[PDB]
Design a binder for this molecule. Structure first.
Ligand SMILES: COC(=O)[C@@](C)(O)C(=O)[C@]1(C)C(C)=C[C@H]2[C@]3(C)CCC(=O)C(C)(C)[C@H]3C(=O)[C@@H](O)[C@]2(C)[C@H]1C(=O)O
Ligand SMILES: COC(=O)[C@@](C)(O)C(=O)[C@]1(C)C(C)=C[C@H]2[C@]3(C)CCC(=O)C(C)(C)[C@H]3C(=O)[C@@H](O)[C@]2(C)[C@H]1C(=O)O
Ligand SMILES: [Ca+2]
Ligand SMILES: [Ca+2]
Ligand SMILES: [Ca+2]
Lengths: 140, 140
């Protein structure tokens, strides 16, 4: 797969991610793919089934959620390891107020370049902690 | 510059980073180089002079620092943009005890591949907040 092939798959992943349904967030992934969350305070690993479960749980909190590659000039592509790095803006509305953050996604594509075989995601963990404290403070 | 050229310069940057003096942390950088932070919550941008001063400040807290590539197999190299990505463990001896975290470093090398022209660093921002809370607890 060419540099452009790898980026196109990563951009398709993002397109389907922004549909934000359990069906759509798996639709550009290999079935044995795992999704890693970077940094010790938020470290986690999710297979396809756990990813769909996480998406459905997020949908209980997020009324909407969109991510966008901020600048294609930031994008990093390693043709030899079939990896693409995006730096993304994430934006949404939730039951505890606005979500606004940025994150780094690393994709490793399948051998044919057409699917995401592994994901690593680096979030703003302090922001996640603040958001969780808003969730943890729900009262009626 | 080849793939091996780029990794070598990045690895030299890390070695001199771990020496952790104001001169050593700029020794592998171009004169106009800029260091960026990823993530809104600890967003900072520093030129050479600002990086030296920040090192001197940090040395008041960090007695010793070691960042190390966790897995060379995870390293990302983009020959076209001259970029290298490391996922690093960070380990520190500080005035409030042990520092232990992980971070992602992105380097963009100069045209000849011998210096670091631009740096982006993604830290565990929740852990940075936890550490500052430890610092703010110093009691005589
Ligand atoms: C961590 O990588 C991911 O985003 C994916 C590829 O693993 C996901 O499919 C998951 C299920 C999806 C759809 C969304 C994220 C978020 C809700 C996206 C918005 C966010 O920035 C936050 C940090 C709130 C995300 C998460 O909490 C993510 O852990 C999930 C739920 C994500 C997952 O796999 O962890
Ligand atoms: C990404 O770190 C860098 O490249 C720079 C330009 O920000 C730096 O030179 C500084 C001076 C250096 C040497 C170290 C960092 C750290 C102490 C590295 C270890 C860390 O994990 C932490 C997060 C505690 C770092 C920081 O706090 C950084 O602010 C500094 C001290 C960094 C700087 O301030 O610029
Ligand atoms: Ca639920
Ligand atoms: Ca909680
Ligand atoms: Ca303080």
């Amino acid at each position: 797969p060419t540099r452009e092939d790898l980026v196109a798959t990563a951009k398709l992943f993002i397109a389907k991610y922004n549909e934000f349904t359990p069906e759509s967030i798996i639709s550009v992934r290999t079935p044995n793919s795992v999704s890693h969350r970077l940094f010790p305070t938020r470290n986690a690993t999710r297979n396809i089934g756990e990813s769909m479960e996480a998406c459905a749980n997020a949908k209980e909190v997020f009324k909407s959620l969109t991510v966008s590659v901020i600048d294609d000039n930031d994008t990093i592509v390693d043709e030899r390891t079939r990896k693409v790095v995006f730096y993304l803006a994430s934006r949404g509305d939730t039951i505890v107020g606005e979500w606004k953050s940025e994150c780094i996604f690393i994709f490793q594509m399948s051998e044919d370049g057409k699917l995401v075989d592994r994901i690593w995601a680096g979030f703003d963990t302090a922001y996640m902690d603040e958001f969780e404290s808003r969730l943890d403070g729900i009262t009626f």
